[PDB]
């Protein structure tokens, strides 16, 4: 469930959340409110990208996982398919003049 965003990144979620939060320890130890008006606005506009990056990357996976008869078997090759040797079913396909069964 978290793999809709690469796990190389859930740590970098923290690092910047730390690097902004540490400024309150600059204020206390180590214009008006422009100092934090720039940070919180760039931060908001930044974290507002991570959500859209996540939402689209999730939708990009979820739409793809909504794309998956004899035709379905016929028009592909990953799934092997067959019949009992020298039985009426094998003969049916061997003698079928219908395209798809002929393909199979």
């Amino acid at each position: 469930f978290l793999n809709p965003l690469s796990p190389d990144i859930w740590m970098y979620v923290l690092l910047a959340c730390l690097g902004v939060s540490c400024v309150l320890f600059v204020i206390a130890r180590f214009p008006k409110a422009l100092s934090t008006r720039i940070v919180g606005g760039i931060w908001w506009f930044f974290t507002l990208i991570i959500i859209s990056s996540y939402t689209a990357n999730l939708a990009a996976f979820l739409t793809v996982e909504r794309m998956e008869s004899a035709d379905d078997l016929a028009k592909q090759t990953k799934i092997e398919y067959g019949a009992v040797r020298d039985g009426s079913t094998m003969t049916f396909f061997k003698k079928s003049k219908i395209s798809t069964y002929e393909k199979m």
Binding site: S6, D8, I9, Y12, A16, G19, V20, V23, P31, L34, S35, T36, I38, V39, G41, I42, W43, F46, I49, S53
Partner: peptide
């Protein structure tokens, strides 16, 4: 990849605050 394109814009506003008042 395109993941990291805005980690620099993130890192842009961080140093931009340091040079505001001191």
């Amino acid at each position: 990849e395109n993941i990291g394109g805005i980690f620099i814009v993130l890192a842009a506003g961080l140093v931009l605050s340091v040079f505001v008042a001191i």
